[PDB]
Each structure stands twice: as C-alpha cells, then as structure tokens.
Design a protein around this ligand. Structure first.
Ligand SMILES: NC(=O)c1ccc[n+]([C@@H]2O[C@H](COP(=O)([O-])OP(=O)(O)OC[C@H]3O[C@@H](n4cnc5c(N)ncnc54)[C@H](OP(=O)(O)O)[C@@H]3O)[C@@H](O)[C@H]2O)c1
Ligand SMILES: CC(=O)[C@H]1CC[C@H]2[C@@H]3CC[C@@H]4CC(=O)CC[C@]4(C)[C@H]3CC[C@]12C
Length: 325
C-alpha cells in the first residue's frame, strides 16, 4: 500500500500525512550554521515530503529557506510539502497562541503550517527564556489549562493559519480531558511521542487507534545518545543483535529495520539526519516488508524504558510520565 511515490495516510480531519519525514533537532551550540537547510534540500531531492521542526530548535528559518528554494526550483509545490511546527511550554496562555504561530510563519516566510501541536502538556512561565529558572535555579512553571489552550489552537485553524491540530507528550488522561471537553470543535488528529523497538507504546497506541488519533514516533532511531541529556543507561538501539540479524535477511541496516517496523504498523516516523548518505538510507524502506513473525520478534524487544525521560520536570503538576500511559 505504501510506496516511495505514494505514502500519505489519512488524518481524522480529512487531511493526510506522509508516513516518513525528516526530523530537524540538532544541538545548537555545536551544529554548523546551514547544516539544517542543506539536509532538508537533500531530503526533498531524495523523495521526502514531510519535515518536522520547532521554533525552539533555533533553526526553523533554515527549514523555510530550503522549502522555499525547492518550490522556486519547481521541484515541488507548496501543497506537496507537509510541515509540522510546535507551540512551546512558555506559550500556553490562550492570548499568546496565535501571536506565537504568526512568529513561526514570519520565520518560515509561509502563509500556513500543515500541522501545529502543543509541544508538552506542561505550562511554563511566559517569556523569551525557553527554559526559565529563578536565581536559585528552580524551574518557573505556570498553571496548565489544556482546554483553554486548545480553544486558542482551534481559533488558529479557523483563521486559516494551520490545516491540522495535534499534541505531543500527552498521556491518556490528558488526551481524554480534551476529547471530553464541552463545545469541542476540532479534535486532536495526532500525538507525537517517543516510539521504537525498546519503547513500543503498546497501550497508548491502542488507545489512540480507538479514537482515530495517529501516533508520530519521535526519536525513532533511539536518539543521538548525547551523554549530556539522554538516558544512556539503556543500550544503543542500532547495535541490537536481533535488529542487525534481521537486517542481514533483506540486506538492510538496523536503522532501516526499525523504521519499517513502525510505518508498517501505521505509525509515522520522523528520523533526523544531517548526513548525506544516512538521509538517503533512511528513506529506502518501501522495497521490502517484515513478515508477521518478524513484526512479533521486534515487538518483543520492548523494555518499557525511555531514552527521553525529562526528569528535571518530574515535579510539574502535568508531568506526563508518572502514569502507566
Ligand atoms: N516532540 C518532542 O518533544 C520531540 C522530542 C525529541 C525529538 N523530536 C523530533 O524527532 C526527531 C527525531 O528524533 P531525534 O533527533 O531525537 O533522534 P533520532 O532520529 O532517533 O536519531 C538521530 C541520531 O541518529 C543518527 N542517525 C540518523 N540516521 C542514521 C542511520 N541511518 N544510521 C546511524 N545513525 C543514524 C543521527 O546522526 P546524523 O545526523 O549524523 O546522521 C543522530 O545522531 C527530532 O529531530 C525532532 O524533530 C521531538
Ligand atoms: C533541561 C535540559 O537539560 C534541556 C537541554 C536539552 C533539552 C532536550 C533536547 C532534545 C528535545 C528537544 C525538544 O523538542 C523538547 C524535548 C527535548 C528532550 C529537550 C528537553 C529539555 C532539555 C533536556
């Protein structure tokens, strides 16, 4: 059903999303300027039609430059590209939502985004500082009001500034608060969370399927394993013995196996790479498939251990990972 030329799956609001996209987060202080822009252009030339980014990644402008250059080149039309942007924790106050989205539209120099989502369910103190803390280093929070924030997001879609609305890092309870709100106009069509063979998200995936919510798997290759912040106590996903053995069966790498695993499952994947060769490699997942047995072999690798724990915010009232799911 999925092919390199046609691989967009349906969203509940009538729109669709390419099952594979290019992730764009990269350590600001150590990433050479221009690397993102170059990588997005390579991705589009390769066949990618979905790009995932965020204003807080510090390189959202590079994503826009690349997209606009390829449209000017005649390679693709605006309607052929799918961009996802995100609303950070410091911008949850209802009145700040549209203004924040409009800032991202100026940065990209585009009229609308295809998908805009609430980055985390936790509200932080408003301000320029993306990671606000007081003199004693204590995190500065704000009282969350997910429904009020959602109503502001719905207004953005009515204004034509975004085609689809979704969320990220939301657990079952949080999704239900929005799903059951009186006067709901646009239900969430997507929930972006960490997902790969070591954290398969069995119960959250099933809840989302029952409500027609598509899951987008972030850190689909297990993260960059940056010792500065990743939970590296859990082993390197791409070096897994089984995943590598399965790759030898089809002459594919472990990375290609884990990506095929999720897409064949109806789960969107957004692997990040700023390397020419690897950007190409990740897209070659439509010329083979995994047997029903192999899908079960992979599902069994689940350790229920997150690479992205966000332990520094476990004290926030809306921290999403205390619950089972
Ligand atoms: N919603 C959220 O809160 C949230 C959180 C985390 C991430 N995300 C999104 O999800 C995207 C993907 O997640 P991620 O960046 O954390 O990690 P990831 O995609 O799981 O892994 C990226 C790392 O793998 C390397 N890599 C890429 N392709 C490879 C291949 N074929 N073989 C070997 N290594 C390969 C990359 O290096 P090279 O670049 O050198 O290839 C990089 O170090 C992000 O960029 C971002 O857009 C969202
Ligand atoms: C409090 C911290 O140590 C910061 C520095 C690194 C930040 C992480 C970078 C990767 C992604 C980026 C996002 O989109 C939000 C979630 C993380 C995990 C981000 C969390 C804040 C960190 C750990």
């Amino acid at each position: 059903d999925l092919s390199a030329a046609s691989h967009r799956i349906p969203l509940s609001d009538g729109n669709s999303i390419p099952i594979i996209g290019l992730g764009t987060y990269s350590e600001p202080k150590s990433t050479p300027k221009g690397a993102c822009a170059t990588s997005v252009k390579v991705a589009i030339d390769t066949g990618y039609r979905h790009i995932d980014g965020a204003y807080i990644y510090q390189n959202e402008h590079e994503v826009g430059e690349a997209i606009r250059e390829k449209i000017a080149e005649g390679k693709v039309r605006r309607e052929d590209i799918f961009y996802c942007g995100k609303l950070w924790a410091t911008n949850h106050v209802p009145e700040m939502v549209r203004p924040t989205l409009e800032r991202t539209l100026r940065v990209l120099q585009l009229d609308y985004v295809d998908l805009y989502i609430i980055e985390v369910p936790m509200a932080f103190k408003p301000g320029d500082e993306i990671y606000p803390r007081d003199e004693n280093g204590k995190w500065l929070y704000h009282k969350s009001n997910l429904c009020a924030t959602w109503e502001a997001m719905e207004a953005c879609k009515d204004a034509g500034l975004v085609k689809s609305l979704g969320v990220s890092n939301f657990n079952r309870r949080q999704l239900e608060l929005i799903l059951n709100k009186p006067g709901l106009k646009h239900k969430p069509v997507s929930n972006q969370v960490e997902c790969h063979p070591y954290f398969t998200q069995p119960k959250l995936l099933k809840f989302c399927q029952q409500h027609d919510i598509v899951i987008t798997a972030y850190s689909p290759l297990g993260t960059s394993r940056n010792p500065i912040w990743v939970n590296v106590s859990s082993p390197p996903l791409l070096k897994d013995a089984l995943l590598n053995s399965l790759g030898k069966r089809y002459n594919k790498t472990a990375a290609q196996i884990v990506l095929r695993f999720n897409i064949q499952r109806g789960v969107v994947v957004i692997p990040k790479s700023f390397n020419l060769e690897r950007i190409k490699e990740n897209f070659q997942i439509f010329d083979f498939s995994l047997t029903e047995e192999e899908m079960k072999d992979i599902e069994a690798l689940n350790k229920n251990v997150r690479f992205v724990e966000l332990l520094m915010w476990r004290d926030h009232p809306e921290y999403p990972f205390h619950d089972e799911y």
